[PDB]
Amino acid sequence: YIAPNPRISSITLTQRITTTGPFAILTGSTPTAQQLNDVRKIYLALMFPG
Amino acid sequence: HTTDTKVFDKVAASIFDTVAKCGHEASPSKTMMTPYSVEKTQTHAKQG
């Protein structure tokens, strides 16, 4: 599994000024074991259509 | 503006040569030249 590039959400202009994305709290969060299992379920369902 | 060793050595040698020719004596053992550590008036700071 590969995460997207971090530079997409936020861009830096100078050393003290940066832009903020709309989903910072969700981007900064980390999954738990059960959430990881649910993600695996999502991908398994996607890869077998019907 | 550089990271080459030979340029930095010549710069330091120029500083010490100048302060020596100026008449005073500057000890290379106490003189400090660092990126990340800052000291003044018995106050010390390391990496913020």
Binding site: P6, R7, S10, T12 | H1, T2, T3
Partner: protein
Amino acid sequence: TATREVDFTVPDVQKILDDIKALAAEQVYKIVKVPSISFRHIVMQSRDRV
């Protein structure tokens, strides 16, 4: 937890400027007294042809 992974999301523009300034001093040509040898001769037991 915060300092667990190394971050690369902030590019060092000063480093790039220093690199370009250093590259600007690269030399391409050479000044020589005698051009390089382009033709050579193999000698054999003959005294008339090489």
